[PDB]
Amino acid sequence: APVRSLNCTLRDSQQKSLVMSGPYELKALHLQGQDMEQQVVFSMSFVQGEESNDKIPVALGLKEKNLYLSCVLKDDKPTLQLESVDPKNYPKKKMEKRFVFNKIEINNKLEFESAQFPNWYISTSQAENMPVFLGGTKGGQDITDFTMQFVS
Numbered sequence: 098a099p100v101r102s103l104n105c106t107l108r109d110s111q112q113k114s115l116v117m118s119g120p121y122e123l124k125a126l127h128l129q130g131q132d133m134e135q136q137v138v139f140s141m142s143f144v145q146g147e148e149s150n151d152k153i154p155v156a157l158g159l160k161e162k163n164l165y166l167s168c169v170l171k172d173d174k175p176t177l178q179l180e181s182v183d184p185k186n187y188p189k190k191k192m193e194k195r196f197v198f199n200k201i202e203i204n205n206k207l208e209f210e211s212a213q214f215p216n217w218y219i220s221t222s223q224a225e226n227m228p229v230f231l232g233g234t235k236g237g238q239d240i241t242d243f244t245m246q247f248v249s
């Protein structure tokens with residue numbers, strides 16, 4: 098059948114929202130009120146991959162954009178990028194592995210592990226206005242926990 102998707106927003110566990118902040122870049126900042134319309138709406142697709150009760154493979158597309166979060170080696174390091182695709186072909190159930198995140202539910206929060214790069218996570222910094230990135234530990238000063246808000 099088709100691939101199933103849900104519209105949503107994400108907030109880090111410090112309650113920073115995510116906004117597109119220039120060509121193919123996502124930043125996290127504290128937002129409330131009118132400025133919250135700026136937050137990124139994701140289309141979260143439920144994709145093919147290894148699955149368990151609390152570990153669900155997803156792709157994170159930007160709503161009504163041919164842009165996906167993806168994990169690739171850059172200058173020899175696992176990194177997070179926004180990657181454009183052929184809009185005729187996406188989303189699909191069998192997403193390429195660089196687009197797949199394991200959405201892990203622990204203690205009423207979510208982590209998004211790279212399926213391609215085990216133990217690398219979608220991360221934010223403590224400081225405001227810094228990039229969303231792929232971070233190689235769910236332990237230390239960087240934030241790897243999120244909450245999801247369902248959007249109409």
Ligand SMILES: CCNC(=O)CN1C[C@@H](C)OC[C@@H]1C
Binds near residue numbers: 118119
């Ligand atoms: C710099 C380009 N920014 C936008 O088009 C803003 N929108 C992007 C969309 C994925 O999430 C909702 C948000 C309102």
